[PDB]
Each structure stands twice: as C-alpha cells, then as structure tokens.
Amino acid sequence: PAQDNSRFVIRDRNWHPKALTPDYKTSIARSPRQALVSIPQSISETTGPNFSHLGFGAHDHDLLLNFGLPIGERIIVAGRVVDQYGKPVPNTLVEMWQANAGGRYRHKNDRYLAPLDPNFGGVGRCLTDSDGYYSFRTIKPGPYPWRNGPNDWRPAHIHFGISGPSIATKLITQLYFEGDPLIPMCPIVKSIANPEAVQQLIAKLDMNNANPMDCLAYRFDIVLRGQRKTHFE
Amino acid sequence: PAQDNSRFVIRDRNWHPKALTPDYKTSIARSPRQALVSIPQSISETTGPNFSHLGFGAHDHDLLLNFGLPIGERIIVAGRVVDQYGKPVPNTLVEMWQANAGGRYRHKNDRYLAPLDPNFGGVGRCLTDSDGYYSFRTIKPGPYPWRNGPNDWRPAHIHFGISGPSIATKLITQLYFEGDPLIPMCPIVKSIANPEAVQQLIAKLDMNNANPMDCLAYRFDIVLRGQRKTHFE
Amino acid sequence: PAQDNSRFVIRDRNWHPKALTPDYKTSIARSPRQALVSIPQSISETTGPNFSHLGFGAHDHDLLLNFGLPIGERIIVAGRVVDQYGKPVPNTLVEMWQANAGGRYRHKNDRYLAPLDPNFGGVGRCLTDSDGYYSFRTIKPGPYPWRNGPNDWRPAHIHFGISGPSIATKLITQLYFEGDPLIPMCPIVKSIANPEAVQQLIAKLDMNNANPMDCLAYRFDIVLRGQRKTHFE
Amino acid sequence: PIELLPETPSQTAGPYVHIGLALEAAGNPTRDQEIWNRLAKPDAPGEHILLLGQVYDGNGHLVRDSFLEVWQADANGEYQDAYNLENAFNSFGRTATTFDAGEWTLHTVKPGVVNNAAGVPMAPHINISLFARGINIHLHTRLYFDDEAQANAKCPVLNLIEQPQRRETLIAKRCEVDGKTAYRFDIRIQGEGETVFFDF
Amino acid sequence: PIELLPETPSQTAGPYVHIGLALEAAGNPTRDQEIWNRLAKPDAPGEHILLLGQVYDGNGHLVRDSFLEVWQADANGEYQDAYNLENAFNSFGRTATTFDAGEWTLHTVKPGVVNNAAGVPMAPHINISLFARGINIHLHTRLYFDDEAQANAKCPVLNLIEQPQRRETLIAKRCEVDGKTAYRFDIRIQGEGETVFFDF
Amino acid sequence: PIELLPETPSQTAGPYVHIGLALEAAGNPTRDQEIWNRLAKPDAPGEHILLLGQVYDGNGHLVRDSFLEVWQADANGEYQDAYNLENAFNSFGRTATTFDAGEWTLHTVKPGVVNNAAGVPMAPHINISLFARGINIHLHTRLYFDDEAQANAKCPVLNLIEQPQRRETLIAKRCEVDGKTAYRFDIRIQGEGETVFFDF
Amino acid sequence: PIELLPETPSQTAGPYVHIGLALEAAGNPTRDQEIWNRLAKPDAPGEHILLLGQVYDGNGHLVRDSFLEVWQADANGEYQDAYNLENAFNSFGRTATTFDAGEWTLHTVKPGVVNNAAGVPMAPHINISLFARGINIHLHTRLYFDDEAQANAKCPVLNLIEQPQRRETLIAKRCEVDGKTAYRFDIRIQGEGETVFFDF
Ligand SMILES: O=C(O)c1cccc(O)c1
Ligand SMILES: O=C(O)c1cccc(O)c1
Numbered sequence A, B, C: 001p002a003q004d005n006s007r008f009v010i011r012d013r014n015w016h017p018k019a020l021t022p023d024y025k026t027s028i029a030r031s032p033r034q035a036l037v038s039i040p041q042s043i044s045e046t047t048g049p050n051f052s053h054l055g056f057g058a059h060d061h062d063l064l065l066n067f068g069l070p071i072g073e074r075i076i077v078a079g080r081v082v083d084q085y086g087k088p089v090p091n092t093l094v095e096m097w098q099a100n101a102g103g104r105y106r107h108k109n110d111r112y113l114a115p116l117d118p119n120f121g122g123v124g125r126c127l128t129d130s131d132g133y134y135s136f137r138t139i140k141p142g143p144y145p146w147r148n149g150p151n152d153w154r155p156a157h158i159h160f161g162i163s164g165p166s167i168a169t170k171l172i173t174q175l176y177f178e179g180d181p182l183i184p185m186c187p188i189v190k191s192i193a194n195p196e197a198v199q200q201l202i203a204k205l206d207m208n209n210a211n212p213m214d215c216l217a218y219r220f221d222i223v224l225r226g227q228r229k230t231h232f233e
Numbered sequence D, E, F, G: 001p002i003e004l005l006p007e008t009p010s011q012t013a014g015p016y017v018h019i020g021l022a023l024e025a026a027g028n029p030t031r032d033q034e035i036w037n038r039l040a041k042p043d044a045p046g047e048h049i050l051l052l053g054q055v056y057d058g059n060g061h062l063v064r065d066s067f068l069e070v071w072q073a074d075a076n077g078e079y080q081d082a083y084n085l086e087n088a089f090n091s092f093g094r095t096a097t098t099f100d101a102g103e104w105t106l107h108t109v110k111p112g113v114v115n116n117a118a119g120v121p122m123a124p125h126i127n128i129s130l131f132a133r134g135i136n137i138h139l140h141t142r143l144y145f146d147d148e149a150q151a152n153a154k155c156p157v158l159n160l161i162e163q164p165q166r167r168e169t170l171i172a173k174r175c176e177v178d179g180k181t182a183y184r185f186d187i188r189i190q191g192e193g194e195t196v197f198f199d200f
C-alpha cells in the first residue's frame, strides 16, 4: 500500500485561475463564497493511484485509428511531464479529449451545426515513459461558439487530465495552439490573471517532430507540483 | 469640555486597504456588504480623549525591562507623529505590541511551537512629546506562520495604535522592517493595493540613532489625518 | 593512500577579497607585504582528507537539539556544494558556527551585553550526500557590534567551513541573509571588491523548503574550485 | 490638484490585539493605570446604565476577538476629553468580547444630547469603533437608545440613512440586568440585518 | 527568494468532460478497461456500502455535468495505489452526475482509520475532487460518516475547521437502499450550507 | 574566453572560529569525535616529533586567535586521506594558538619524501593553512626541517623562491622538549623576516 | 536606511595655517584678543606645568609647520567651555611648532580626573588635535602623565588599546625646565613608535 514519504510544494492560487471570474458566466454560481480551509499534507493527500497495470489498447493514444481516416490536419501532440524541480514524472496517466476538425464534439449535448466525422471519436490516453514523455496522434480541433456572451468562440483546444504521483498533483487543463487569434479574446483563458501563465498553455509548432509529407507536430510540456522528501518533521 | 473647532481631511479609502480582500481569508466573512454611510463631521467626530494625565510607569516604553534580559536583537524604534499638513501631533498616545524573537506571542491562544521568553512581555505605550516624537526600546520580533494559505508567514512586525487629536484620527497599523523578503508575499500586506502605500509601513534602519556596542535603531514616522480650522461653514 | 590525478582551476584572486583592506582594521597588520609565491600543483596540494568515516552524532547538524528549545527564528539552511564545472561534491565536510538570536557567541571572549541562550551552542557539521546536498536546522543569528569604526555592525551571518576534495579547494566563508540592510555597510563584506561576488554570499529565502507552521528555509549553494583530470603533462 | 502627505495606511488589529490594548482580557498582568470598560464612577451624575452586546460575522457566527473603543458625552451632553482615572466620568472607554461567551460590556451613563455643526441637536448616542482580525480598517457606528424614539426621529445623523429599515440596526434594546438598567447592542458585520457603518 | 518552474495552470473540465473521462456516461462506446465507480468487488474485505449524492450550485439548482474523483483507504485503513481491475479493492474511483436525475453513486467499503503526519488518527473518510464546467480549478472535500461521531469529534482535520456548524457539512447521512447500507452526501458549492473545501 | 561558475568568495574566520573548529580551545564541551592536534598515536611508525610555534603580526605582536590546518604524508611518504580516529596515523590535523601564551602544538611524525608532478622528490614537508580574524583569505605555507639540509637544497618547491634568504623562513629549527624531539616554527605574517606564503 | 545631510568634507590646513590661526607664529601683527598657548594664569588653582614636544613624519623628520589644539579639564576635573582671556584658566588652547627648532610649548595646570559615560574615571589627560600640510583630516590623540601610573593602569580609554606597547606612546615624560615641572610629549605620525590616534 502507499506510504507518506513526500511533501508537495504548495499551489500558487494567484497563478491558477480564481474561482470567481465573472466574464466566464457559469463560474458565477459554481464558485465557493467561503475561503478554502488549509490543511497539512497527510498520507491521504500525498498518495494517489498508479496506472502502470491498466490495460491500454494498442491505439489508445492514436485518435486517427481508435474510433476510414478522419478529415482534418494530421498532427502529433507530444511533450514531457516534469515536476517544479524539473524532475520527470514517469508512468503517469495522461488523458485527452477534443472536438473534430469542425468544432463538433461526439457528445449527446453538442448541438453545434458542424457535422460529426464518422471516423473520429476524440478521446485518447497515454502512460508517460521512463523519461516522462507522452504523445498522441490526432487531427487539429476547430474553434466553436458557446453560449457565454452573444458572440463568444473558444480557441481550438485539447482538454488534458494528468494524474501525477498523488491526488495533490492531479490536474485538469487545456492546450491552445500557437498563434491562434482567438486566445486573447477567451473568457475561459482570461480566467488566468497573469499573461505569463497563459503562455504555459500554448503548444508550440514543432517541425523537428513532424513526419515529412505526413503530419505536423506540436510540443506541450506539463509541470506538476514539486515533490520533495520530508525534513525535520 | 471639548469643542468642535477642527475639520479633518477626508480619508482616502483607495489608499487604505479595502474591507474585502479575499487572499486575507478572514476578511471574507468580516467585511460589510453595504456601502458605508458618509456623514458630516460634528463635535462627536472631531473631538477625542487626551491622555496627558494618564499615569505612565517609568518603563512603559521599555520592553527590555517592563516585563533578566530578553533574548534577541536589541533595537530602538523611534519616529514622529505628524498630520497630512506636516504638523507635529504632541502629547498623543502610541501603543505597540509584538511577538518575541521567535515569533511567539504572550497570549493564551498562541500555540506556535517557538517558546516564550521569560524576560519578555511585548507591550509598550509612550506619549509623544511637544515635537511629536516617541520612542521604544525592544527586541526585533520574528516572523510567524498563520493559518491562511497552507504556507503563509507574517513578515516580522510590531503592531501600532495611535490616538491623535480626535476619534476621526485614531489608527491601528503595523510596522515592517526594511528589506524583509516576506513583505511582498504577505496577503495582509497586500490588502493595500498601492505599492506606494506599503512603503509607508516600512521602518528604515537608522544608524544615526543607534547606541554603539549596544543596540540598533529603526525610524518609523506616522502621518495622521490633516487637521484644519472650519471656514465659511 | 591518496594519488595525484587531479588539477584544480587556479583561483581568481581579484574575485576573492585581497589581504589588505584597510576599512577592516585588523587586516592592516595581518596581511603579507611580500607577493605570494606561485607553485605548480603536486600531490601535496591536490589531495586532502576524506571525512566519510568520521563518527558524526545524530544531531550534529541540528542546532535546535545539539546543545528546552532556543529562542529565535527557526530556519533550515540547505544547499548544494558543486565545483566550477557544476559537478556535485559528495561526502564533503561542511562545518558552521554562529551567534544566538541576539548576536551573542558562546565564547569566553564575547562580552557583548546580549545574553546567552541556555539551550543554544551554535555549532553544527554535516557531510554532503551523493548529490552534494547538506542541511542544518538552527535559529537566525542576530547582528552584533564590533570594535572596528566607532559604530560598526556585522550583518547577521553564519560562518562556514568547507573541505572539498583537497587542501586546494578548502574554504572558509560567511553566509548572509537576503535583504539585510547591514550588508552594504560592512567593511568585512566590502573586503570583496566585486558586487557580483557579494551576491554569492547571500542566502535566499526558500519557501519551497520550509515546513509550514514550523520553520522557514534559506538556500545557500557553494562553488568550490573546478576539478579536472591532468592532460598532456 | 493639491496633494497633502498621505495618511499612514491602516492594518488589521490581528488576533492578539488584547495583549496591547486589553491586558486583563488577554489574561496578562496589567499596569497601574489601564483604559477600560467603566466610564463612570458610582457617584457620577446621570442615569447609570449597563451596555452589552455580541458581534456576528457574515455567517452568523460570534466574533470572539473583537475590540471596541467608545466615545460619548456625559449626562450634561459634554465631552470630557481630559482622561483621568480620578475623574468620576470619562468620555472614553475600551471593551472586548469574551473568548468564551463572546460578549462585551460597559459601565457608563446615558449621554446628554449634543448639536451638530448646523446647531441641530442629535439624539443621545455613543460612538463606537470596532477592531478585529479580518477587519483591515476599523468600522465606525453609533449606539442609540430605544427609549428615545422622539429624539431618534429627529436625528440629523440617523435621518441621513436612506432606508428607514437600516436605521433600526442602530437602536439599542432596553432591558434590565440584575434589576439594573441595561441596553443590548448587537453588531452584524455583514448580511441580514447588517449594521450601518459610517464614513467621516 | 528561490523560484521553481511554475505549475501548469488549471482550466475548467468543460461540459464534455464525460467523453474523455466517463465514456459510459457520455453514452459512447467504452474501451476494454475503464476507471469507474466500483472500488470493491463482492468478495472485498470490509463493510460494503453505497454512496450517493447530488451537487448544487449557488442558486440551489442541480449541477448535472459534474465529474468526481475519489481516493480512500481499504477497510484496514490501507491505501492501495496499484490500480487494477483484477483487484478486489481499488482505493481510486470515478463517478459523475446524471444528465437527468443528476445523482452520482459509488460502490465501495467503509475506509479504515489512517494517521496524520503527527501520528494522530483521522476519522474514517473519503477524499473527493469535484470537476465541472464553471469550475476553473477543482474543489477538494472530504466525506465523513454520521455513525462515527466519536472518531469525528477527535479528527485533527475536522478540528481545523473553526466553526462547528461547518463541520456538519462534511458528514454523510446513513440510510438504506434496497436494504443495502447507504450514505447520502450532498455538495453545495455556494451559499447556505456551502460545503467546506480544502487547500493542501 | 570560456568562463566557469565563479568560486564562492572567502571571508575571514573571525575571532570566534574556535567555537566551530577548536571546541576544546574555545573552552566549550566537545563532541565524541573531534579533529585535533595528534596526528600520530604513540605506536605509529616513523620518528615521532613535537611541533610548536608562534604567529606574529606586522607589529611583531603575537596573534592569539589563529587557527591552523596541517596536511602531511606518513613516514613512508604517503598521504592517508581516509580520516579515522582509529588510525595510528592521520595525514590531516588541526591546531590553534593559546589565548594566553599564544603557542600552538602538534603531535606527529616526520613526513617521508613525496615527488612533484615531474617525478622530482621534494624535501620532507608539512603543508600549512593559516586562518584568523584580519585574514580575508587563508595563507598557505610549508614547514621544512633544519636537519634535512641536503634534501632542502634540492627541493623543486623551495627552489622556486628567488631569494635564498626567503627560503630560510620555511625552515623549522630542531630542539628538544622533555627529552622529546621538537621543531619550532614561527610564522611572521608581515614585515622583517616575513614568511613565504604560496599560491597554487 | 535613513541618511542625514553629509558633513562638509575636511581639507588639509596647508602650510600657511599660521596666518589664520597662529598670527604671532606666522610673524604677523596680532589682534587684540588671540587664542594661544597660555591656558592658566599664574593665579590659577592647580599644579602649574609646562608641556613641550616635537612632531615627526614617517621618515623621522621634524614637522615644522604643525598646528595643535588642546582641550582639558581644570584641576577639579571640570571642563571650562566659557572662553575668556579674563579667566584665570581656559580649558582650550592652541600652539604650533617652530619653523626653526620645531617644538611647541603649552603653559597650563595638571587636569583633574573625569569619568567616562559609564561612570568610570579616566586618568588625567589632555585631548589633542593635530593639523598640518599633508594631513587631510586632523589626527586626534591624548596626552597622559608618567607620574599617574596608578591611574593610567585603570583608564578605560587607555585600556581600549589592544597592545600595551602602544599605550606607552601616549605617556608624557616628566622633567623640569628652569626648575619648573615639565612633560615632554613627542608625536610620531608614522612608523617606529607611531603614536596612537583615535576615532570618536
Ligand atoms: O473574488 C473572490 O475570490 C471572492 C471570494 C468570496 C466572496 C466574494 O464576493 C468574492
Ligand atoms: O469588493 C467590494 O468592495 C464589494 C462591496 C459590496 C459588495 C460586493 O459584492 C463587493
């Protein structure tokens, strides 16, 4: 069973988006009005599931094949998972979901007029390697309109979920594409107060990783909370 | 009795910290939601107590003897009390309290593990002289952790209370020490939106005032609301 | 026995303080007037003691327990010892000494009026690990007056002694604390001509390494002479 | 425009205010002379009364570390600014809420009427300043008496409050404590029944 | 001060979180192995229980697109980190609220007691993480049981919550579902009876 | 040119160096294991000798707060780097001067011959490092023996000192203390008879 | 830190200091009232003595253009600040060295004992300030007497001088001049037997 041997650097709640960000309408009623209660880390918080023995399918991470070929821009999304100390996070669970080339999600509630793609599902998962590397093969998602302001459009994005070594490190986020003119207009993106933090969410075109005459590549590294041994406790 | 002859410059409520400052968790539930009701100044507001006849002990302002010798950095905290017009505020009451060298307060509810100092109490009072000068002799207090965020630490500080000429001028504040790296990270400090206002709370090392081979000195001036005569009222 | 396999990068005597620094009065009569004689490195200079078998006590590095609890600011002083090539120096001896919270040393010759702390000795030692890491637990020392100019005060500091791999790398220095206003006025500090060299002596506040609700931490890294193998000798 | 020196910024009193301003309350040895909660000596002219109340936060929870300062006129509606323990009546006082019960109490006399700047008389009242951890800048309020409806009705200050409902939050409720005239004044910092706080 | 690399900033899970992390719930074909709401198989040691609840917004309206993650010790107060569908018990699970009823359910066992860093025992509990559209950064809570009042009174975690009334927000109410021991745990994100959320 | 990381700058040991490195001398309780002035147990091979000396400033006044470190080969001309209190012989030692007499002492054996990088034998010597208040960066010297003239005349190190008269400053003078072989080695930091200090 | 206005920087007196501060010495006509080397009138209480000396540069050469200022207590150990030619005793004086013989003289009384700030008595002394071309900022010293050995031994000032050999530089040598009690005080600015100079 797991053991309490680690401490995780405290989260900077001024770095991460706040709970109440009124331009993002839904946050109004879904944000707490009372202050969060701080508690010391115990084994409850410093441990988490290990997915090494989960039975991954052969194309769990290849969205081009896991659902004919999907229509859209063929891309590889790769990067590494490291902690705040710059240490790789091996055998960690990386999950992702997204819309198709038109901005359509394969979900009951998605009524957007852009058509579904009969060869695309939009879900992948990958366990990072010994060096903290992950990769997926998919198609570039399209932006889509949503009921916020009368003319709001989400920039093209991929949703990501990362496990890390504990429940203290677990994170849900979104990757944006370098140069997307929609980024600075987004109320969700704007939930993040510091511009420098926004930069962390933008995948960079990575020509070095592309497959000539086949597909482009984007690089997206993720930083989880720094893990340290306990001392003089 | 007292008479209504003065008027006091209206307070700048954008200069002082606001009531609701979310990072300072306790302010959440302890800040009014309705606007303050402004009212004209009357004798009720423009008068206040005078402590010229209070019977002060001879060591009232000497924390080194008023409680052996306390352990810690021997310092002198001196300065002047003026109004916004630059006029000295003579015979006014200055009160201060602080933790010991380890950041431990001599109070029931302070369960911080740094120990108490048998020769230290942590309270002083001084009446300004005819030039608005006051002085204390103490030990520099230590920073201390508090239950705000998971790792919040108060910068070293001395609590101050100044009467002034009326209840309109009475003030409670904190003095911080020049160069303390904790200053900029404190959420109580940050309740003050203007960086310029923060600066005003920082005591400056004063070598000129030090007793060689004995103790250092810190200069801390206080500015109370400007006092003026009524006119064309 | 030891073997002559290494060469150490020549010291930069313009980086380190010179011998004669008149503001530091004692340096006057204790600095050579003849130039140092340069000599080639031999086994005599390229070897030194290895303290791996020294029998360290379990609290050799904990000043809180090695002498009740001391009064003062609880801090952890940690860092790494690397060489100029950035290579870790494992299993090396790090020794430290310092005053108590009030700037008083537990030494016969110290007649400063700040009292001794019945639970504090002020001496520690630690052998670096595999990665060149060391760590001490102590209380933040206070500044103290000394008979140099008529009103001279040493900034708060910890004296450090480092062995390294040979008598060639052995070094004695002082650690200073980030933001201390006394730093720039100390004649000992000023013995160092290059401001950039001074910066290396300043321990930075390290919140990441602090124990919430218990103590703060400071990071101090040490760089010893670069070690290289001999070539074409 | 013209700008004066900026006033020193306020900071919360914090949780340990007691050690500096309410030694008895903090459970520490007091000095010879201390400023406390008994404004009037038994032989001071005027109707002697007992004041008591609690302080609530926005959640309806008791604030057990609040510190209050009061300023009032004597029976003759005069402000005695020369503070002395020897005096029979002092216009200034200090009180704090019990870390247990969380209630404050004061011993004084019902203050006489004073006029505003315009020469219009104000209903008898006690000026209060509230301090505590969580309060960045102290809160100013006034205590009024329920048995002074007539006067209260004409108050030039009380009449500045737009909504009549808000005015009632400033009126203390007459009661008796051990057959002694008492008045209960509860302060609600935030939410339902939030007390009026002033700026001047 | 020392600055490390900043952590990647959080972002809301959004309304389609199910496609990615709750396949069955989104009504899409699932893969061979999925992380779902069954932490224990019939032959797992301990007392088998059913957990269910609803999630409310600040308006008292049901949040029908919420996603929840759970982490708990096995009946021996042990944390089973090696996740495997072959296991009789998994310490980790996932659940979500119905687009219709908007109620989540979990099948597990009552967690054994675990000690805090200082060696002090915490009352039986389940660690919860709440995700959904409108929530920028996930909310952390703990589920305690009403039938553990004695343990609950001595919990060093429960005890850090200043106001006793708020502690109640964390206690699940024991019931029965098809003669099966059940506990109801409702979450109120905002307002009256707002659930306590932690930072660690 | 290529620049490496700069070495951490030296600082004076200060007046209280004894507290950290010469515990006994500071007149403070020692630890179980201390590094001191006895390099050789009485049963170690070689010619057992006693070393003693004084340290003078530029005014010819005794330096009573100096700290010294020594490094030498064993009688077989070998450096024993693994330091252990169990060893009969240790290559490394520590000494300091009396706050009173201001004289240091060391109990060792006469070092055997070592060769330089070129393969040329150096005369028997002890490597010394001098620390003290007023000394910003420690001073390096060597102790040679007066009864080794032959070897001394051919030392490649000693031969690097231009002036013959200066070489004389590194030669310890043989004596006898209580019918024990001793060598006196005085250090003159500055002025007339100033000791040769090295850079390497 | 706090910074005051910087003090006006000192400059050497220059070779012509006499024209301004020692008119007679410069060989120029003097004014009605001059500040000179006769502190005590024959009718002044105390032991009447003559002080004399020479000033030497670092080469052992006489400084024939020096200017000296003296401050001392009267025989009761009292400082007489109210300067008047009418006074039988003035605490202040001025002298200078002959362009010829290069010797200064002073006519005064032996000063009485004065206590330091801590209430400890200092041995009888005369405070001296030396000015001259080549001296950028004047030198402060003190003259003590060889016949106050008992007192000298206990002076907290003299005791601040680390090295006893240096304390002797401050001791005037008692002699007789034309059957009068004289003390000789030579000042060596630099080198062999360099006189202690103070900073305060
Ligand atoms: O912006 C916030 O974080 C906040 C927190 C609590 C109440 C409130 O009105 C606002
Ligand atoms: O932020 C404020 O100052 C404030 C004042 C009143 C209501 C409110 O929601 C916020």
Ligand SMILES: O=C(O)c1cccc(O)c1
Residues within 6 Å of the ligand: C018, C020, C032, C033, C034
């Ligand atoms: O400043 C120096 O390094 C120095 C070195 C030798 C003689 C001297 O006067 C000065």
Ligand SMILES: O=C(O)c1cccc(O)c1
Residues within 6 Å of the ligand: B026, B146, B154, B188, D012, D013, D014, D015, D133, D134
């Ligand atoms: O407001 C607080 O909670 C607080 C806690 C510690 C020190 C202080 O000044 C204030």
Ligand SMILES: O=C(O)c1cccc(O)c1
Residues within 6 Å of the ligand: A026, A146, A154, A188, E012, E013, E014, E015, E133, E134
């Ligand atoms: O929070 C939402 O309403 C939303 C809508 C669309 C995409 C997304 O990530 C979030």
Ligand SMILES: O=C(O)c1cccc(O)c1
Residues within 6 Å of the ligand: C026, C146, C154, C188, F012, F013, F014, F015, F133, F134
């Ligand atoms: O060299 C000194 O005189 C001195 C005095 C105090 C501390 C220190 O490191 C050095």
Ligand SMILES: O=C(O)c1cccc(O)c1
Residues within 6 Å of the ligand: G012, G013, G014, G015, G133, G134
């Ligand atoms: O010091 C000098 O030699 C000198 C010479 C001329 C003018 C003066 O101020 C000084």
Ligand SMILES: [Fe+3]
Residues within 6 Å of the ligand: B154, B157, B159, D014, D016
């Ligand atoms: Fe405080």
Ligand SMILES: [Fe+3]
Residues within 6 Å of the ligand: A154, A157, A159, E014, E016
């Ligand atoms: Fe989306």
Ligand SMILES: [Fe+3]
Residues within 6 Å of the ligand: C154, C157, C159, F014, F016
């Ligand atoms: Fe020191």
Ligand SMILES: [Fe+3]
Residues within 6 Å of the ligand: G014, G016
């Ligand atoms: Fe001139």
